[PDB]
Structures are given as C-alpha cells and as structure tokens.
Amino acid sequence: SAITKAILNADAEARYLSPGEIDVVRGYLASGERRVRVARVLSDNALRIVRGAGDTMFQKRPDLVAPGGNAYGEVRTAKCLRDLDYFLRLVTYGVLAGDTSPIDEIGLIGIKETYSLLEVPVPGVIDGIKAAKQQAAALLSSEDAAEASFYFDYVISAMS
Amino acid sequence: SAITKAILNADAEARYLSPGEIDVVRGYLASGERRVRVARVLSDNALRIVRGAGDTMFQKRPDLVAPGGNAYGEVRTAKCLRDLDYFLRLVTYGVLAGDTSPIDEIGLIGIKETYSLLEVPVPGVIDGIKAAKQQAAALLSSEDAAEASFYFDYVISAMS
Amino acid sequence: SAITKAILNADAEARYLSPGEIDVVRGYLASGERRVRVARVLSDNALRIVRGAGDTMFQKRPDLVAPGGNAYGEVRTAKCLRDLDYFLRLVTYGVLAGDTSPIDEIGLIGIKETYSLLEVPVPGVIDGIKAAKQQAAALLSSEDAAEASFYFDYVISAMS
Amino acid sequence: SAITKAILNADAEARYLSPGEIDVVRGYLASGERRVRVARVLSDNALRIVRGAGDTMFQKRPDLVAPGGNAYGEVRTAKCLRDLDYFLRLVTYGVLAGDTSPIDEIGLIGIKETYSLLEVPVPGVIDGIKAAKQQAAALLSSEDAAEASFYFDYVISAMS
Amino acid sequence: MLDAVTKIINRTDAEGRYFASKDFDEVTRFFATGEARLRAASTISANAASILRESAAALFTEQPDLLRPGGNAYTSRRYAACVRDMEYFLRYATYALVAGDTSVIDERVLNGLKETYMSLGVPIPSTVAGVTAMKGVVASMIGSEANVYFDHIAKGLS
Amino acid sequence: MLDAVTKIINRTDAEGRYFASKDFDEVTRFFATGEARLRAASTISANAASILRESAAALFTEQPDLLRPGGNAYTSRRYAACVRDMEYFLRYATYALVAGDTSVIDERVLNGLKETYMSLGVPIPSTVAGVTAMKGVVASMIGSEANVYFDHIAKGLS
Amino acid sequence: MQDAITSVINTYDVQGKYFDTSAFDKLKAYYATGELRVRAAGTISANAATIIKEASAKLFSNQPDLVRPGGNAYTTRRYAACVRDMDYFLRYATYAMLAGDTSILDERVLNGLKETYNSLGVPISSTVQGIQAMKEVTGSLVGSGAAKEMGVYFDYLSSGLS
Amino acid sequence: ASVDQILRASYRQILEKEPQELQRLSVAESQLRNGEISVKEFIRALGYSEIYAKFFLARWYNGKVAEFNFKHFLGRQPASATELGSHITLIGTKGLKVAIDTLLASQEYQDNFGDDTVPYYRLQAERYVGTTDAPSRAYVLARSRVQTALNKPTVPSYSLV
Ligand SMILES: CCC1=C(C)/C(=C/C2=NC(=C\c3[nH]c(/C=C4\NC(=O)[C@H](C)[C@H]4CC)c(C)c3CCC(=O)O)/C(CCC(=O)O)=C2C)NC1=O
Ligand SMILES: CCC1=C(C)/C(=C/C2=NC(=C\c3[nH]c(/C=C4\NC(=O)[C@H](C)[C@H]4CC)c(C)c3CCC(=O)O)/C(CCC(=O)O)=C2C)NC1=O
Ligand SMILES: CCC1=C(C)/C(=C/C2=NC(=C\c3[nH]c(/C=C4\NC(=O)[C@H](C)[C@H]4CC)c(C)c3CCC(=O)O)/C(CCC(=O)O)=C2C)NC1=O
Ligand SMILES: CCC1=C(C)/C(=C/C2=NC(=C\c3[nH]c(/C=C4\NC(=O)[C@H](C)[C@H]4CC)c(C)c3CCC(=O)O)/C(CCC(=O)O)=C2C)NC1=O
Ligand SMILES: CCC1=C(C)/C(=C/C2=NC(=C\c3[nH]c(/C=C4\NC(=O)[C@H](C)[C@H]4CC)c(C)c3CCC(=O)O)/C(CCC(=O)O)=C2C)NC1=O
Numbered sequence A, B, C, D: 001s002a003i004t005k006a007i008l009n010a011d012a013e014a015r016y017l018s019p020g021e022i023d024v025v026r027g028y029l030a031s032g033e034r035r036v037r038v039a040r041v042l043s044d045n046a047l048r049i050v051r052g053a054g055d056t057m058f059q060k061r062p063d064l065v066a067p068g069g070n071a072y073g074e075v076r077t078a079k080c081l082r083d084l085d086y087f088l089r090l091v092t093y094g095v096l097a098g099d100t101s102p103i104d105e106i107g108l109i110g111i112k113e114t115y116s117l118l119e120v121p122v123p124g125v126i127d128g129i130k131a132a133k134q135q136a137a138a139l140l141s142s143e144d145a146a147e148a149s150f151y152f153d154y155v156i157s158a159m160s
Numbered sequence E, F: 001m002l003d004a005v006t007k008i009i010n011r012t013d014a015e016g017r018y019f020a021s022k023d024f025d026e027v028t029r030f031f032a033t034g035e036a037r038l039r040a041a042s043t044i045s046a047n048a049a050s051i052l053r054e055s056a057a058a059l060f061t062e063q064p065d066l067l068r069p070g071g072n073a074y075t076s077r078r079y080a081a082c083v084r085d086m087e088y089f090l091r092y093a094t095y096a097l098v099a100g101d102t103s104v105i106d107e108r109v110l111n112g113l114k115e116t117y118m119s120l121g122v123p124i125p126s127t128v129a130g131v132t133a134m135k136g137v138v139a140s141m142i143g144s145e146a147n148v149y150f151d152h153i154a155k156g157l158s
Numbered sequence G: 001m002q003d004a005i006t007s008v009i010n011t012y013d014v015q016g017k018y019f020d021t022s023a024f025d026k027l028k029a030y031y032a033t034g035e036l037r038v039r040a041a042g043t044i045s046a047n048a049a050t051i052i053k054e055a056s057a058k059l060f061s062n063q064p065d066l067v068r069p070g071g072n073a074y075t076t077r078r079y080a081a082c083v084r085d086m087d088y089f090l091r092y093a094t095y096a097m098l099a100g101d102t103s104i105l106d107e108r109v110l111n112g113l114k115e116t117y118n119s120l121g122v123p124i125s126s127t128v129q130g131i132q133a134m135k136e137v138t139g140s141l142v143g144s145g146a147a148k149e150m151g152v153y154f155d156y157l158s159s160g161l162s
Numbered sequence H: 001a002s003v004d005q006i007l008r009a010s011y012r013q014i015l016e017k018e019p020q021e022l023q024r025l026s027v028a029e030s031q032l033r034n035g036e037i038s039v040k041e042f043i044r045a046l047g048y049s050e051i052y053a054k055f056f057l058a059r060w061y062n063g064k065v066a067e068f069n070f071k072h073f074l075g076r077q078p079a080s081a082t083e084l085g086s087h088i089t090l091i092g093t094k095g096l097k098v099a100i101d102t103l104l105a106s107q108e109y110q111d112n113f114g115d116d117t118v119p120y121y122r123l124q125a126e127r128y129v130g131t132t133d134a135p136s137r138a139y140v141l142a143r144s145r146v147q148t149a150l151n152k153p154t155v156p157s158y159s160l161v
Helices: A002-012 A019-030 A032-044 A046-060 A074-097 A101-108 A111-118 A122-139 A142-159 B002-012 B019-030 B032-044 B046-060 B074-097 B101-108 B111-118 B122-139 B142-159 C002-012 C019-044 C046-060 C074-097 C101-108 C111-117 C122-139 C142-159 D002-012 D019-044 D046-060 D074-097 D101-108 D111-117 D122-138 D142-159 E004-014 E021-032 E034-046 E048-062 E076-099 E103-108 E113-120 E124-142 E144-157 F004-014 F021-032 F034-046 F048-062 F076-099 F103-108 F113-120 F124-142 F144-157 G004-014 G021-032 G034-062 G076-099 G103-110 G113-120 G124-142 G144-161 H003-014 H026-034 H039-048 H050-056 H062-073 H081-094 H096-105 H107-112 H135-147
Strands: none
Touching: A002 A019, A019 A032, A032 A046, A032 A074, A032 A122, A032 A142, A046 A074, A046 A122, A046 C046, A074 A101, A074 A122, A074 A142, A101 A142, A111 A122, A111 A142, A122 A142, A142 C142, A142 G034, B002 B019, B019 B032, B032 B046, B032 B074, B032 B122, B032 B142, B046 B074, B046 B122, B074 B101, B074 B122, B074 B142, B101 B142, B101 E076, B111 B122, B111 E048, B111 E076, B122 B142, C002 C019, C002 D019, C002 F076, C002 F103, C019 C046, C019 C074, C019 C122, C019 C142, C019 D002, C019 D019, C019 D142, C019 F021, C019 F034, C046 C074, C046 C122, C074 C101, C074 C122, C074 C142, C074 F004, C101 C142, C101 F004, C111 C122, C122 C142, C142 D019, C142 E034, D002 D019, D002 E076, D002 E103, D019 D046, D019 D074, D019 D142, D019 E021, D019 E034, D046 D074, D046 D122, D074 D101, D074 D122, D074 D142, D074 E004, D101 D142, D101 E004, D111 D122, D111 D142, D122 D142, D142 F034, E004 E021, E021 E034, E034 E048, E034 E076, E034 E124, E034 E144, E048 E076, E048 E124, E076 E103, E076 E124, E076 E144, E103 E144, E113 E124, E113 E144, E124 E144, F004 F021, F021 F034, F034 F048, F034 F076, F034 F124, F034 F144, F048 F076, F048 F124, F076 F103, F076 F124, F076 F144, F103 F144, F113 F124, F113 F144, F124 F144, G004 G021, G021 G034, G034 G076, G034 G124, G034 G144, G076 G103, G076 G124, G076 G144, G103 G144, G113 G124, G113 G144, G124 G144, H003 H026, H003 H039, H003 H062, H026 H039, H039 H050, H039 H062, H039 H096, H050 H062, H062 H081, H062 H096, H081 H096, H096 H107
C-alpha cells in the first residue's frame, strides 16, 4: 500500500519515517473512508459493470466474438468476461491500497506475455477496461469517479 | 371497415345513407371475393412471406442482427420476425376490411413512440415491410398485388 | 431566460414580482459570473469538445460512417460534426440563459421531425451529446461540470 | 412553498424538473437556515411588534378608535390587534415557505370583500402593516430586515 | 399539493399558533436532506428513458401474458398506454421526492385512478407489480430514497 | 418576450457563432446591474398606488379639460380606464426594467394600442403627457434607471 | 534537479535570508498551479502512447523520407529508437511541467544531445518537427492552461536542440 | 391550473376584460370552484351573459359579431366568405346564443380545447389546414388579429375576406 511504499523507502535509507512520509501515511489514513466507499460501490456492482463493459467491448469489436475470434465460443467468451472481472477486482484493490502494487503483483506483471502468447488482442482488453471505467463512473460521484479512474487508466496504460 | 366508415359519415349528420355512401358500400360488397382471395393467399403464405422479408431485411441492413444491433440475439430477432408477422396479419385485415382502421387500432397507433422507446430503427422496419410487399407481389397476380400493395404502402407511410 | 419566466408568471396574475420571483431573479444574477465562466470554457474548447465527442461517437457506433451510413463521406461527417457543434453552442446558450428556451427555440423544436425525415439515427446523436458532455466535464471542475451536464442532459432527454 | 411553485410549473408542462427549477429549489434549500432564523426572531417577539404597530396606527389616525369609528370600543380593538397578529403570523409563514402562497390562502384571498363588508378602512390596515414593518426591521439585521420587508410589502400591496 | 414546509405551516395554522422549536426543528430536518433528494431526482430525470425501458422489460418478463393476444398490453396502443402510465408514476414519484410529501401523488395520480382502472379493465395487481419493478429499478440507481413514494402509489392502487 | 441575455444570445445566434469576449463583457455588465434594477423594481412595486395617484394628479392638473364633460376622461368609466392604462404602463415598465429589454412592452402593451387609441378617440398627446408625468415621478423616486422604458411607451404612441 | 520551490529555496539560501513576502508570493503562485499540473501529468501519463502514435504519424507523414530506405528512421531498430526518443521528450516535458522548472531538461536531456545526434547523423531539424508535433498533440489532450504550460517546456526543448 | 387562474383567463379570453372591471358570475364561479361544471360550461356562461351581448352585439354589425365570436371561442378568425356568412346567418336568424352554441359544439372546439381549457390563439399552420377551407387566409387573419389584439378593428368584415 501507500504505507508499505513509505516504509520500504525509509528502510532503503535505514531511517525512521520522515515528515514527508508521515504526511503520506496520514493523508492515506485520512482517505480511508472515501476509499472504502469507492471500493464498496465497485464491488457490489461488479456484475453489472462487467456485463456492461463486455457488451460495449463486443459491440465495438465484433470480430472478437465472430468465428475465428479470440473470444469465440461460450467458454472463451466466459473467460473474457472473467478477465474483465479480474481487472475490476484489481482496480478495487488498487483503490483500497492507495497504490498500484497489488494490481502489478496479481494482474499486470506477465499479462503482456500471457496475452501475446494466447493471441489475446490487448486493444480489446483496453476497450473493455475503458467500458468498465465509464460504467463505474456512472455509479460514482465526480470525486469518487475521479479516484477510481486513476487506477483504471493505470491499468490501461500498463496494457499500452 | 368501409361500411363502418360510411355509417359513421351518415351518423355525424344524423341522416340515412347517401347515394354516394350507398355506392361506396355496394362497391365494397362487390369486391368481397377479390378481398377474400388476396387475404387467403396472404394468410396461407404467412410463414413464407415472413421468412423471405426478414431474410431480405437482414442482408439489406446487417447492422440489425450484428452485435450491438437492435435485433441482435435470438429472442430479439424472433420478436422482429413476430412484428413482421403482426404487420402481415394487419395487412390482411386491411385488405378484408376495405379500410385501414384495424391496422391503425391494432398496430399502427402508438407504434411510433413504442419504437422510439425501444430504439427500434423505423427504416429497418420499413425495409422489412417493403420486402414483405415484394414477397406478396410474387405470390399474387398483378391486380391482387396492386390491391395488397395499397395497404402495404399505407403501413409504410404510417411508419414514416 | 430565468428572468423571463418569472416576469411571465407575475404577468399571469397581473401583479408585480413576488418575493419568491425576486428571489429567483436574484439567485440567477448571483449565478451569472459562474455561468459566464463555464460558457467561456465551453466556447474556447468548441473544437476540442466537438472532435472528442465525434471520435467517441464514431468509435462507439461505427455504422454511421460505414458504407450505407448516414455520415458516410467527408461531407456528411462534416455535417454531423457541425450538428454536434450546433448542439454545443446551444448548450452554451442554455448555460448563459439559465433555462432551456434558447435550446428549444433554435435547436430542439422540429429537430425530431427533421432527423426522422433525414433518417438521422437519434441514438447516435445521443451518443454524440453524451460524449460531448464527458469531454466538457473533463475540461471543467466538479461544479461547472454539474451545471454543464444539466443542459447536456436536457438535450439528451429532449432528443429521446 | 418555493418547491410547490417549481413542481407546479413542471407539472403544467407535463415534464421533469428543468435546470432552472432545480436551481430555484437549490437556492431555497440553501436559504432555509436564514429563513428559519428570521422566522424565529419574528415569532419570539410577536407581542411587541403587534403592540407597537397598533399604537402607531392608532396615533396616526385617531378616527379609527373615535366614536363612530370601525375600531371604536374594546372588543373591536381586540379584533384589530388580533388581525395584526394574524398578518404577522402569515408574514412569518411566508418567510419560512419562501413564497407568498400561505399568506394568500390563509389571509389575503377574500380579505378585501371582508373588510369592505365590515367597513374596515383599508388605509388604516395599511398603516398598521407599515408600522409592523418598521417595528420588525427595528429588531432585525439589514439582510433579515429586507427579507421580512419583502413579505410585509407584499401584504401591504395586496391589501390595496 | 403540499410539501413538508407547507404541511407544517398548515398544522401550525390549524392551531393558530406561531412556530415552536419542534416545528423549526422539523423544518430544518427537511432543509438538511434537500441536496440528497434533489440529486436523486436529477438522476431519475436524466435516466428516465432507461428506467422506463428496463422496468417495462422486468414487468413483461415477469408477466408475459399481458403482451400476448388478449392481454391488456396487447397492441401498440395499449403497450404505449402502459409505458405511459409508468412514466406518470415515475414523474410524480420524482415530484413527491423533491417535495418530500405524498400529497401530489394523492391529488394528481391516485385521485379516481382505481375506479378508472376498473372501468377500463386495467388489471390493478399487474400495474402494482409494474410499480414494484420500477421501485427496484430506481433503488438500483439512487438507493432507497424514493421507496416511500412508490409504496404510496402501490398502496393507493391496491 | 426577451431579456438582455436572451437578446445577446439571439444576436450571437443570428451570426452562428459562439460567445466572444465582447458578448461576455455585455452579459457581465447586465449581471452587474441586476441588483440595482431589482431594488428599483421593488421600490416601484411598494409604492405603485402612490405613483399612480400622483401621476394621474399631474396629468389632470396639466389638462383639466379631460375631466370636464365632453372630455375623453369624463365619466367614472373613462377615468377608470385612464388610470388603469397608466397602471398598465407602470407595471410593464417595471417588467421591462427588470428584464433590461423593452420587448415585454412591445408584446403586451403596444400590440395595437396606438390603433385602439386612434379608433376610440383617446387623445394620444395627452396620453404621452401622462406617461411623461409618470416617468418624472418614477425618476424622482428611483432615479433615471427607468426613463428609457417610459420613453419607449411614448414612442409607441407618438 | 531543481523544481520551483527548491529554486526559491536555493536563491534565498545562497543569499542567506529567510523567506520574505516576495518568496512567499512565488511559493503561493507555485502551489496555486499545482492541481492543474497534477491533472495534466495524469492525463499525459494516461495518454502517452496515444500521443506518441499521433505525433510520430504526423512527423512521418510530413517527412516520409525518414522511414523510407536511406532515412535515419529506416529499420525496425531505428524506428523503435526514434519513437523511444519521442517518449523521452514527452516524459521529460511532463517532469518539467510538474516541477514548474526547466532545470531537469538541462541536466537530463539537453546536455550533450546535439553532440549525440550529430555524431549519429540523426537529423535535428526533423527531431524539432517531431517535438512540435508532440506539442500540438499534447495540447489537444490537456486543455488551454495545461497546453500553454506544456508548450513552454516543448519550446525549451526545441530551442535547446535547434 | 387553479380556479382563480382559469377564471381570470376566461374573463380575458371571452369578455376581453379583467374580472374587477366586470360584474362577475358568482354562481357560475362557485360551480366551477366546486367542480360540478367544466371550464367549457363557464365559457358558455360568459357567452350567454347580457354583458357579452352588450360588448359584442349591441354596437356591432353581424359580421363583426361573427369575428368576435371566432376570436373569443375559437381563438381565430373566419377565413372564408362561406364560413363568415353562415355564422352571420346563425346570429341573424337564431340569436347570439345559438351561434355561440354552434361554435362550442364544433369539432374544432372539441379538438383544440375540449372541456377544461380556456381557448387561445395558435399561429401554426396545423391549426388551420385540416379545419379551415382557406388555411393560409385563416393564418393571415388570425395573425393580424393577434398582432393588434388590443384593438377592436373597424375594417369591414367582408373586405378582409
Ligand atoms: C487474477 C489475475 C489473472 C489475469 C489478469 C489473468 C488473465 C488470463 N487470461 C487467460 C485466458 C483468456 N483470456 C481471454 C480474454 C480475452 N478475450 C478477448 O479477446 C478480450 C480482448 C480479452 C478480455 C477482455 C480469453 C478469451 C482467454 C482464453 C484464451 C485461450 O483459451 O486460449 C489466461 C490463461 C489461462 C486461462 O485460461 O485462464 C490468463 C492467465 N489470469 C489471472 O489469474
Ligand atoms: C399486434 C400489434 C403489435 C405490434 C405492432 C407490436 C410491436 C412491438 N414490438 C415490441 C418489441 C420488439 N420489436 C422488435 C422488431 C424491431 N426491431 C428490429 O430491429 C426490426 C428493425 C424491427 C422489426 C422489423 C424487436 C427486436 C423487439 C424486442 C425489443 C426488446 O424486447 O428489447 C414491442 C414491445 C413489447 C414486446 O417486447 O413484446 C411491441 C409493442 N406489438 C403488438 O402487440
Ligand atoms: C395590459 C395591456 C392593455 C392596455 C395598454 C390597454 C389600453 C386600453 N385602453 C382602452 C380604452 C381607454 N383608455 C383611456 C385612457 C385615455 N383617456 C384619456 O383621457 C387619457 C389621456 C388617456 C390615458 C392616460 C380611456 C378613457 C379609454 C376608454 C375609451 C372609451 O370608452 O371611449 C382600451 C379599449 C378597451 C377598454 O376600454 O377596456 C384598451 C385596450 N388595455 C390593455 O389590456
Ligand atoms: C525494413 C524494415 C521496416 C518495416 C517492416 C517497416 C514497417 C512500417 N509499416 C508502416 C505502416 C503500416 N504497415 C502496415 C502492415 C500491416 N497491415 C496489416 O495489418 C498486416 C498484418 C500488416 C502487414 C502484413 C499497415 C496497415 C500500415 C499503415 C498503418 C497506419 O498508418 O495506421 C510504417 C509507417 C510509415 C509508412 O507507412 O511507410 C512502417 C515504418 N518499417 C521498416 O523500416
Ligand atoms: C396548406 C397551405 C399552407 C401553406 C403553404 C402554409 C405556409 C406557412 N408557412 C409558415 C411558416 C414558415 N414557412 C417556411 C418555409 C420557407 N422557408 C424558406 O426557406 C423556404 C423557401 C420556404 C419553404 C420552401 C418557414 C421557414 C416558416 C417559418 C417562419 C417563422 O417562423 O418565422 C406558416 C406560419 C405557421 C407555422 O409556422 O406553422 C404558414 C401558415 N400554410 C398553409 O395553410
């Protein structure tokens, strides 16, 4: 989390937390209620967010679910929706942790190699994650949506 | 119906039927066999006309059955075919009645706001009805085709 | 505008402006500088918002520019973008006026019939307006986005 | 109240609340606490405003309490100060509601016919309400003085 | 129609008494919850078409028989009237949500409606099922803020 | 009718352009004067009866022959119609003063007034003298802020 | 490196004085623009790949000889290095905009870059054209004030090269 | 709309005066307020009044009376010579009340205003195309009448048609 990153920093120079790092930890603990609210909204609405994101992604890119597409078939389409759900849950983790470390550890490191070898079109994943980002922003206030969009765009930029 | 229209016209002025109204009703009664013939041919070929018109519409506007289209999905394509069959039944009603009142009071009045709310593309519906017109013209002779084309055209004009 | 509605309401009872109507007028005059700021922001970024909304709409709904599409061609796409700019200018007018009367009188009254005759897909227009709303909300703060979205949503509702 | 006027306007046009009516409602809800303060200070001191205004009205025109006058006698003066108390309570109601409607339904619709039948001098009542406005502004801050003065002036104007 | 402030004013006027501390407190409670109610109403207004579409979908998925021939929703016109009535309920629920009081519903919606549905042949229990469906649709978007007014409409029908 | 802001909007729309710096300056100038115009309107509304009383006094002091038998203001009915006209002029001048634009006077006051006065034999110069007396009264009461609107009414009759 | 705050700090340390009203005005001015800078940096970071795609496409459309044989950007390696350098310029402009100071562009970018490019044969005029293309593309994403700010650092890079 | 708004609107639409200038129809107003008569029945009560005949028939030619009836109860003007002549004949042979009844029972009235709305003008071609045998002429006359609504024109009725 943010706390872990500050602790790792202070440990590299073998010192106690500095005023800046205390400010980071304090401002993170201050944001706890807002992060919990955002994560609750994204978590309780994961099903409709993933359904909507998948619908938008498939309308935008029909060839994925057309014969010969990477997502063609019930099983492959199910795994596609499961990947979108995975990335939504990773976004919730990133919101809760106040940094992108859990997203990197669980989902991003190796996802480029994984998708290259499975022949999964990364732009399609980006389209689905953008759709999920707008579907989440529909469910959140302006500040909460802005908070979630940071981690959504972080996922997108790691893809691209 | 034609008789209903003449009787209402008589009633509005609180009078017996006029010689012109009598001629209207008599001419309607003369056309009875021709109307029954057209309607019988249409009803006997209901499934054939519906399939052919729907197929023609679906190549003409493939965006409808394409993902993200208004008719994409087996339920929605089935409902599309069912509405085409609805309008074919209404066309038979109009042919038998000699008037367009059954078409209006069963399927035409309110279909505009209904299709607006359902985001049904009216041009697609018009193409489907024109395809049904072509199918009927194939099954009918020239005079019968013209008689049915009157009501097919009335439906087209009402939709737009 | 906001003043016009209050003055007309007073004129209905053949009386001077009531304390409530004066409260309405005073609130509008207080909101004037915020309205001018927002309207200026949407005016300087007119090309900004129009290009962003147009790209978002064409990517969301590509059949508009696909062969047989309404906006197919450079000229028809230019006219589509011009309609988007028209609605952007009308949103600015609505922001400035404090009500929706300029939008109705210039752009909304008769646009539904016009687009029906031209076979302009109203859902695509809704997509364009919602995309423009997102683009403009990007360039504004939270509050300014709120009032700009008010008139963007009025346009969306009136088109649909 | 101020809400009822906006909702009535929306209902008349058979539509949802427009941005302008939303702005009116937001302004009223923002003004609510000041309204409650003004109404509370007016309520707590009602006795002293009534006494001072009645005194001033009596001295300004002695013919009211002189023999042959409408307010001549003890019972008629009791009804006089009762009317002053009534109008003050309606002024507080109008301050709370944000409009003049409660003043209209409870006190001023039909007051002209009543006072003409009872041969009550309307100029005398107007002098009483004026005196009440001075007494009220005497114990109000300038902003609250103007807020109450709008409703006092409305009562005076509708009285004539 | 009344709202919360007007009903309080009426209650104080019936007793001919100036506002007391409890009356002021109730007024302040109404003023406090104003922004949330306005935001809920604005969200409903912006999404009226989608709410109508998905509530009609829920109603006609739960009770398909209304759309079959012989059903009271079987025509273009009767289906249009059904969704139109649902629009009535939604718009007046928004009105009552802003006002904070149900009197607008009783006057503009429920006044003579049960007898009218009996006269027309409208199945009232199915209409109540539609109102409950729209309750669920609106709760999925704005929370439980508007449940009271939809419940009032449903009970007035029932 | 229009107000100042809607007039500026129409001006920018006739040219098919967004608001520029000068347009925003003009709209800001209108917003800045709004408080003063509202104060003037409230001041006029508070004393509308006394303004009307002394305006009619001035008019009929200048031209006593209007009240005498055979004059166009000799009857209870014609005197009442005259002071009702002046009350109309004051109220609609106040409306225009609030709006910052004279279109309300064109729509609601001058829509056939000159033709009506020529038809009925109402003396137009005497009516303009009365309008001018009311303009002077209001100017002494609130300042020059409303003069133009009264002149507009005069120009609609002259 | 030096940001605006540490720039004020260094001036006042060298002259050995506590902060006065003028230093506090400079610091207030930096803090006031902080949210705009953070927003622009987040927007550029989210869009950096798109910005580079658009800018490289415009550059190679305006100068097709770069990517055809005989051009400095002709091979997969040299094309990759070209767009890599464009990634540098975008990233370091974003750093300098977030810091509100061009010192990082001197230390980390411009020092020795003309010599590197002249030794390699990399055409510097075309590199300046690419920087301009990125300036317009970035301005197309970030909005008026952020565009005006980012343009300062893009122009600083252009002047340091050209 | 409230009963007060409806009443003031009806008095302006039918008698061209504010209620204070007139002797109000107290019993008709009470019936409308109590809701056992419609707005249309109040409009007919205003038309049946002796004050209507005093305002619009005592000092007018029958063509002017027909124009007044069309402005008050339909919100428009007679467009053709046949329509104006037919209404004049109704006034001159059956009386003012029967002519007003013919206006109120007309399909035009039922469509535009029905039973609960005060009549009003509408400067739209849909207002006249289906209903009137001279639609453009009907628009021209209605727009001229609205343009100078304050005036009671003395231009001859058959010169306009
Ligand atoms: C929790 C962290 C985590 C992630 C992120 C993850 C991604 C992931 N997706 C996979 C397969 C897949 N992923 C997709 C998704 C694609 N379908 C379309 O093309 C879209 C563009 C795109 C999704 C939006 C599909 C269709 C497959 C099956 C491909 C195959 O069977 O060869 C696989 C290979 C093993 C498997 O079948 O599950 C991984 C590892 N797995 C994880 O454990
Ligand atoms: C007997 C008189 C009658 C008519 C005329 C009628 C039309 C009609 N079609 C409907 C749905 C529909 N209508 C269509 C057909 C359209 N969409 C396709 O793209 C085509 C362009 C086009 C047909 C050519 C579709 C696909 C639906 C499903 C929409 C949905 O349920 O989400 C509905 C909404 C109720 C329902 O889903 O069952 C009506 C009322 N219903 C009637 O009772
Ligand atoms: C709300 C917009 C409105 C306006 C402006 C208006 C003016 C107006 N004044 C009128 C008559 C009149 N106007 C006057 C006033 C004149 N007497 C002269 O001595 C004075 C110089 C002058 C006034 C200062 C008089 C006396 C009449 C009666 C004419 C008559 O009965 O012969 C009339 C003819 C109908 C009627 O008397 O009710 C109108 C329409 N009416 C309106 O509804
Ligand atoms: C000598 C080594 C070398 C290569 C190979 C090379 C490729 C190359 N391909 C390009 C464009 C392109 N290349 C392709 C080729 C793709 N189209 C389909 O997707 C296929 C899968 C695939 C080819 C089989 C396309 C479509 C473009 C245009 C892309 C665009 O402009 O958006 C460009 C951009 C500039 C230009 O159009 O000339 C380069 C530099 N450059 C080099 O220096
Ligand atoms: C049944 C016979 C009939 C006709 C023909 C007719 C014409 C007519 N056109 C009108 C307005 C109009 N008519 C036009 C048409 C013009 N715009 C120009 O660019 C074109 C050269 C030209 C058309 C080809 C326009 C623009 C208006 C609006 C005028 C305005 O609102 O200021 C109006 C005013 C009412 C309304 O706006 O609906 C009428 C009555 N009315 C009738 O009863």
